Design a protein around this ligand. Structure first.
Ligand SMILES: CN(C)C(=N)NC(=N)N
Length: 461
């Protein structure tokens, strides 16, 4: 009588779960401005390049118009993204035990309050060093918020709807990007845009007090009283009678009362070590090949609004395709096919002359669908292939190996565009195709109802 059976008897997609998913959807739209937002507000309109300073003629005011970073400190924007991505690295190494042991829901609430305060302080920051440190904190806190929220969603949802609710969460992320574009068009000033982004965070915390904790992680602490309380509250919420308390409670005496995120037992079991290595390779791929592809995309009209509108309308067809095909053939074959398609798209620009009609749109479309389907696979698979005391140690393969991609892709492309114009495409295609062909074949399996039964990490092998 695992908690999934209790949720099934109480209704996995009841009204209470609907409002909880709405609340964390409101959280999801608050994560896009942290990562995607920069291309809008940190965008130089024009540069005059004695010099005698530089003046940009545009009604909007970006970060570089107000800090004068056009020529003397042009690399500061790269330094700014490097500092944000090092914030992601600091989060990946930091919010583990510090994100679980103090109370998972309470940690999420404290961090979302911290994010609100730090964003408001970014709105009123009349310097640069404080701005950089605050962006470090913003990156760390926002990554922690989004991963904790997503894993909480895949914890509440019972077996049979994890794919649906997670893919709807990613659709909410894409809708957050679309709303970012809309609010960007609403007013070009970065200050008011940041202040308007910070208000969904208030709307989150204001109503986030009533959301309960994760029942399974709470059961992992051998505290089943309030766990049974919250399960019966959920059951009575969506018009259902409570189940048997003894069946609902699972003692699981072999489980440690506290958590010990393994820094050395990850490689103890060969299945877990192999899964972690495969996910490391796959994650590196993903942002690697990605910002790579984005960079290789042509100049979109407008370059600040229609660029985002065209980039965001890619995901939603991909999200719907994933929703349709993720269960009929499992969560391995569709994403493997998408990655092979992305590799073939990367390899086709080299041997085919660009003068052919519609070649640019064909390659951009195929690559992008491939590395949207890859991302909406890998997030769900990393969430599924880790128990509750390993999922927060499972964020590191998500974020401590995508951070290296985000840091290093500008340098790799900067060297590649000089050494050989045909070099970066061959490198990206070779690494992506070889990795996604050898790997992503058997990273355990899919369709497993119990991810944190103390035997999920070993029985699948
Ligand atoms: C948010 N960033 C930078 C991504 N990795 N996007 C993506 N799904 N390739």
């Amino acid at each position: 009588p695992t908690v999934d059976d209790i949720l099934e008897q109480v209704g996995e997609s009841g009204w209470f779960q609907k409002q909880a998913f709405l609340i964390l959807c409101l959280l999801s739209a608050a994560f896009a401005p942290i990562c995607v937002g920069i291309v809008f507000l940190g965008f130089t309109p024009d540069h005059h390049c004695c010099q005698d300073g530089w003046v940009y003629d545009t009604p909007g005011s970006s970060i570089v118009t107000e800090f004068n970073l056009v020529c003397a400190d042009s690399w500061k924007l790269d330094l700014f993204q490097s500092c944000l991505n090092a914030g992601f690295l600091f989060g990946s190494l930091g919010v583990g035990y510090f994100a679980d042991r103090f109370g998972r829901k309470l940690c999420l609430l404290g961090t979302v309050l911290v994010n609100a305060v730090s964003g408001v302080l970014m709105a009123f920051s009349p310097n640069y060093m404080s701005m950089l440190l605050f962006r470090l904190l913003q990156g760390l806190v926002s990554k922690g918020n989004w991963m904790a929220g997503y894993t909480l969603i895949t914890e509440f949802v019972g077996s049979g709807s994890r794919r649906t609710v997670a893919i709807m969460y990613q659709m909410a992320f894409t809708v957050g990007l679309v709303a970012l574009t809309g609010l960007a068009y609403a007013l070009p000033h970065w200050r008011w845009l940041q202040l308007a982004v910070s208000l969904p965070t208030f709307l989150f915390l204001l109503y986030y007090w009533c959301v309960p904790e994760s029942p399974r992680w709470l059961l992992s602490q051998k505290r089943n009283t309030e766990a049974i309380k919250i399960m019966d509250h959920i059951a009575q919420k969506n018009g259902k009678l409570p189940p048997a308390d003894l069946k609902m409670l699972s003692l699981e005496e072999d489980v440690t009362e506290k958590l010990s995120p393994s820094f050395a037992d990850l490689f103890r079991t060969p299945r877990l070590r192999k899964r972690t290595f495969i996910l490391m390779y796959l994650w590196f791929t993903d942002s690697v090949l990605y910002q790579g592809l984005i960079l290789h995309m042509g100049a979109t009209s407008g370059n600040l609004y229609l660029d985002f509108l065209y980039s965001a309308l890619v995901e939603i067809p991909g999200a719907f395709i994933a929703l349709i095909t993720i269960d009929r053939v499992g969560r391995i074959y569709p994403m493997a096919m998408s990655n092979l398609l992305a590799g073939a798209a990367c390899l086709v620009m080299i041997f085919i002359s660009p003068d052919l009609h519609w070649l640019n749109i064909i390659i951009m479309c195929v690559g992008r669908m491939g590395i949207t389907i890859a991302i909406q696979m890998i997030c769900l698979v990393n969430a599924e292939l880790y128990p509750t005391f390993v999922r927060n140690l499972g964020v590191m393969v998500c974020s401590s190996l995508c951070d290296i991609g985000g840091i290093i892709t500008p340098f790799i492309v900067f060297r590649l565009r000089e050494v050989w114009q045909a070099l970066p495409l061959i490198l990206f295609a070779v690494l992506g195709l070889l990795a996604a062909g050898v790997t992503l074949l058997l990273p355990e399996t899919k369709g497993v109802a119990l991810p944190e039964t103390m035997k999920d990490a070993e029985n699948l092998g």
